Write a protein that binds this DNA or RNA. Structure first.
Lengths: 49, 94, 49
DNA sequence: GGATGACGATT
DNA sequence: CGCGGTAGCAGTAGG
DNA sequence: GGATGACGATT
DNA sequence: CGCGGTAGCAGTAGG
């Protein structure tokens, strides 16, 4: 499912402390915060990378 | 789930059934025309290496047009496979 | 949202009696049936067109 | 005689 | 893998 | 000392 | 717009 893949991408992009020491993708939008471990993140139609 | 929740259920022979579907669908286009449905990798491969060159064709990775489904059910005894009732070292493996 | 668009496509494809007199797209999969008015249909990752 | 629901593209 | 909420209009059906 | 939950890619 | 269910392992935390 494309959903799982989208989540994989978001995961690769996240830039809140405690995620990726070096994010290979740039979180151009609400790619989640440290407040919930990236779970806050917005829907794919929202964020860019 | 069946073996764990219900004791002696999987002992009944011919209770659990399986409906299977061909893994790939080949279509012959230029030379002559028919369609070959393969159930597995080995068959499709032996054909792919020992027959494919003799035609112009297209392979379709395995949704299937309902009219093919009607066929699936017209002779479903080929797509139906029965599990063997628990035997030694069946439960153990489960 | 891409969801709404996917639904638009599915709608353009549906081929059960009572849908499209001429479906401009081909329903290559479970594009719904007459049983629920196309609501049965399967998810986008499923059907092709 | 007023209420509820279907339909569809969008949140 | 799947379920749910809301707008907006015209007309039909249900008590 | 047994139970519940977090994490993550996929149904 | 949004919510929920399940597998699979290792170890931590809660009662």
């Amino acid at each position: 499912g494309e959903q799982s893949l989208a989540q994989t991408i978001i995961g690769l992009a996240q830039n809140f402390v405690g995620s990726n020491n070096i994010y290979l993708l740039l979180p151009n939008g609400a790619f989640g915060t440290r407040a919930t471990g990236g779970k806050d993140a917005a829907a794919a139609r929202y964020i860019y990378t | 789930f069946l073996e764990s929740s219900f004791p002696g259920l999987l002992d009944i022979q011919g209770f659990l059934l399986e409906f299977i579907t061909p893994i790939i669908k080949v279509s012959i286009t230029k030379p002559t025309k028919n369609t070959i449905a393969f159930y597995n990798m080995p068959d499709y491969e032996k054909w792919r290496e020992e027959e494919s060159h003799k035609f112009t064709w297209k392979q379709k990775y395995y949704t299937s047009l309902a009219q093919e489904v009607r066929e699936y059910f017209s002779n479903l005894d080929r797509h139906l496979k029965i599990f063997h009732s628990l035997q030694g070292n069946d439960k153990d493996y489960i």
